[PDB]
Design a protein around this ligand. Structure first.
Ligand SMILES: Nc1ccc(C(=O)O)c(O)c1
Length: 167
């Protein structure tokens, strides 16, 4: 048993809810929250900008030190950093950004990072401003992640479309 509430069960291991991931993290304090990161860990917009704002910019300060030491992530890659006030840990995962021309085949590689963690609160990778089809992102998630993933979908209209169209 875990602390996640109000989720629809899609599969043995994948759950979904219409929720603001920031508000969900603040309530649950999960072991792992996933960030929709870019390779520079520049948390300006989207889930990343919202998560970073909720940490009062401490996520960005920590991220800048990580990049100064290690250089940029790979598209499809990840790093584990602090979860600050939102979670124990934040798994920063880089899905391909279609609005920058990145290979959508890298979305499966991105989701494979989730398998290193038994339970995660996450957004749909490459959904929203990263420009991918969220229906596709949910299909790759279900077909790739084997650990327990709680997906928080911000847009109510999209949530309903994802559930209604789910095979
Ligand atoms: N508070 C939130 C939650 C999600 C997003 C998102 O873009 O997916 C956002 O931009 C703000």
């Amino acid at each position: 048993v875990n602390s996640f509430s109000g989720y629809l069960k899609l599969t043995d291991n994948v759950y979904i809810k219409n929720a603001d991931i920031v508000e969900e993290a603040k309530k649950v304090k999960p072991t792992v929250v996933v960030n929709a990161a870019n390779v520079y860990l520049k948390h300006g917009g989207g889930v990343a900008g919202a998560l970073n704002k909720a940490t009062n910019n401490a996520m960005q300060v920590e991220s800048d030190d990580y990049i100064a030491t290690n250089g940029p992530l790979k598209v499809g890659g990840s790093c584990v950093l602090s979860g600050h006030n939102l979670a124990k840990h934040c798994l920063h995962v880089v899905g391909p950004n279609v609005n920058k021309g990145e290979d959508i085949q890298l979305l499966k590689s991105a989701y494979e990072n989730f398998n290193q963690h038994e339970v995660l609160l996450a957004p749909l990778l490459s959904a929203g401003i990263f420009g991918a089809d969220p229906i596709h992102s949910l299909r790759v998630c279900v077909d790739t992640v084997r650990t327990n993933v709680y997906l928080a979908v911000f847009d109510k209209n999209l949530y309903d479309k994802l559930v209604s169209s789910f095979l």
